[PDB]
């Protein structure tokens, strides 16, 4: 399902920030979402961001209290199964092309090692 992200944006000094303007824009023609489709969200009091993010490939931009340009934090990619209750940081670290590929490599090596261990154990029992 379309996952929901929820966290509390915190400045480096333990003070939340209420007036954050987050922009999510997709850039893949994906089910029920279009290329270069933009959308905004403003965090409520306490500096807490919560929204259901439709899935696909979405780059995320920050604007703090007052900012000329928009800071680019990264580009998440959300699929059908992906942890529902998640902060945005663990979304971006765990979903980005470099991180996605490197996670895939990690997983493939893990699976290969598991397979070899299982095969060796089967040989030992046989």
């Amino acid at each position: 399902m379309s996952i929901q992200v929820t966290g509390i944006i915190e400045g480096p000094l333990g003070t939340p920030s209420p007036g954050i303007t987050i922009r999510v824009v997709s850039k893949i023609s994906y089910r029920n979402t279009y290329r270069l489709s933009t959308e905004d969200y403003v965090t409520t009091t306490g500096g807490a961001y919560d929204f259901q993010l439709n899935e696909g490939f979405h780059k995320i931009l920050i604007r703090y209290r007052g900012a000329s340009s928009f800071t680019k934090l990264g580009d998440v990619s959300v699929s059908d199964q992906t942890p529902s209750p998640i902060t945005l940081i663990n979304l971006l670290e765990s979903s980005s092309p470099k991180a996605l590929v490197v996670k895939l490599q990690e997983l493939a090596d893990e699976a290969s090692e598991s397979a070899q261990s299982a095969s060796d154990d089967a040989d030992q029992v046989t």
Partner: peptide, 18 residues
């Protein structure tokens, strides 16, 4: 363009803004 490479094979994601 933010080029991505594994085992020296070129792929290129894009970032487009109006």
């Amino acid at each position: 363009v933010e080029t991505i490479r594994v085992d020296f094979v070129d792929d290129i994601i894009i970032t487009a803004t109006p």
